[PDB]
């Protein structure tokens, strides 16, 4: 249970414990999962690097039993350990691993400043590579990176996490000096 707690040095995100951005029962299903118990034991950002490179698809939960995908497990792990902006930006900027890129993107959308969200997610609209997506049913669907990015910037919920409210760019620009 202690190994599942948010790291001692971590500060609050959007007024709360960063893990609480994920639904209570979703967290519980993650902690219980085979993937989390075997592949997410440890509190290090390097762990996330190694496992992220092994991601084969995006997704949230699937089935009426609410099973987490690896993607969602790593996302929670990231909330728990709160890696530094540098690594997240590296995840995003990297051109070789699309799933790493999307993992960094979702995390940036969940925890970053409005500015950083637009700055780092918007250029990813150019990225039209095909991606594997596991829907709520457990069915695999073809998708494209830029569509995921669009969902991150214009949807209420992605990968079964409710996205924290994000100001429209025009408002942040009108706020600019």
């Amino acid at each position: 249970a202690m190994a599942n707690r948010t790291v001692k040095d971590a500060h609050s995100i959007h007024g709360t414990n960063p893990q609480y951005l994920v639904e209570k029962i979703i967290r519980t299903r993650i902690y219980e999962s085979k993937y989390w118990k075997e592949e997410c034991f440890g509190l290090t950002a390097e762990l996330v690097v190694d496992k992220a490179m092994e991601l084969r698809f995006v997704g949230g939960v699937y089935g009426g039993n609410i099973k987490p995908t690896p993607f969602l497990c790593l996302t929670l792990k990231m909330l728990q350990i709160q890696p530094e902006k540098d690594i997240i930006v590296e995840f995003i900027k990297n051109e070789d691993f699309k799933y790493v890129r999307m993992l960094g993107a979702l995390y940036m959308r969940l925890t970053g400043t409005a500015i950083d969200c637009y700055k780092y997610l918007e250029p990813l609209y150019n990225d039209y590579r095909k991606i594997k997506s596991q829907n709520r049913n457990g069915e695999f669907e073809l998708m494209h990176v830029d569509e995921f990015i669009d969902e991150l910037l214009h949807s209420e919920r992605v990968c079964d996490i409710i996205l924290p409210r994000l100001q429209k760019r025009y408002v942040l620009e009108e706020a600019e000096q």
Binding site: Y125, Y128, H144, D146, E147, D150, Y170
Partner: protein
């Protein structure tokens, strides 16, 4: 070769995205312009009042 049509499929997606974002942007432009017009109208009438009375 065939992935040229993948680039074409992206173009279309991006254009839909641009049209949508452009419409939202204009809608909020129009709102802000209206607010500001009202603010200007108020300020002009205030100065008019002071000169008048």
């Amino acid at each position: 070769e065939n992935d040229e049509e993948e680039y074409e499929a992206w173009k279309v997606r991006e254009l839909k995205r641009i049209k949508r974002d452009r419409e939202d942007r204009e809608a909020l432009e129009k709102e802000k312009a209206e607010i500001e017009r009202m603010r200007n109208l108020t300020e002009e009438e205030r100065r008019a009042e002071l000169r008048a009375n």
